[PDB]
């Protein structure tokens, strides 16, 4: 069994590279962020433009949705994050504290906390209600590329150019596990698996790895794509067959069988690096976004 993702819509509007795409947890919306300093909201099923959200002073690297789909948080080169009310488009809070570019962000599932990572090498944990920084973790010795909470919010995972992944207890901010290989290329992406038992990590050695972080064992490896420079997001696709999905520096979306590690589809259409992909929470739909030769988001649909 293999998927048959086909292009359904191309979403144009951004005027520089598109950095991140995320489906809302209710499935209704797609949010995109860009080097053009803007967030755009689009209908998830037909790609219909909904609104533009503005206020950052420099490019945006990432966006993330609250669990109730009512808030977004964005991470900017302007050294701040902003919390946005999606309905009004208004900036509710500006999160100040990082000393350089903020690259990545996420709400916890509870959505009372935001986690962020920065070029400044720290991971910060922020109170959503007040906008205050609760903890600064001395997380890494090089830029932080990704941050993610697990399903119950009790853990955070971070990746860095220092070649490490680290697992942090949310409440205490203590490091519970450091994952360190024999060689240490930059770790460009990480997230927990749906069940929270594994982490999926990308390295700038053109490789994605699935790890049991408790046991420190690499269970699966996914290769054949191009990823030596950009911090490209990956995903577990779980609405149909169980796949791994990633963008690639050869302008394609790659899809792998999670168990066999075989490449099952390569989606062709973008004209620049595919830096972000997202999988819809209930339907077999992928959103992909590309850098400045392209500037578009594509929506793809499969029967499985």
**CATH topology, anyone?**
Methylamine Dehydrogenase, Chain H
Helix content: under 10%
- The number of strands is 28
Number of helices: 0
State the CATH architecture.
Answer: 7 Propeller
Q: What is the radius of gyration computed over CA atoms, rounded to a whole number of angstroms?
A: 17 Å
Task: Fill in the keyword field for this structure.
monomer; 304 residues; mainly beta; Methylamine Dehydrogenase, Chain H; 4-stranded antiparallel sheet
Describe the structure.
The protein has about 300 residues and is mainly β. The protein has a single domain (about 1-304), classed as YVTN repeat-like/Quinoprotein amine dehydrogenase (Methylamine Dehydrogenase, Chain H, 7 Propeller). The chain has no helices and 28 strands. A four-stranded antiparallel beta sheet has the order 1-28-27-26, with no helix packed on it. A four-stranded antiparallel beta sheet has the order 2-3-4-5, with no helix packed on it. Strand 4 and strand 5 form a beta hairpin. It is globular, with a radius of gyration of 17 Å. The chain starts with 5 loop residues before the first strand and ends with a strand. Its main location: nucleus. It is found in: Nucleus. This is WD repeat-containing protein 5. Belongs to the WD repeat WDR5/wds family. One of its GO terms (biological process) is skeletal system development.
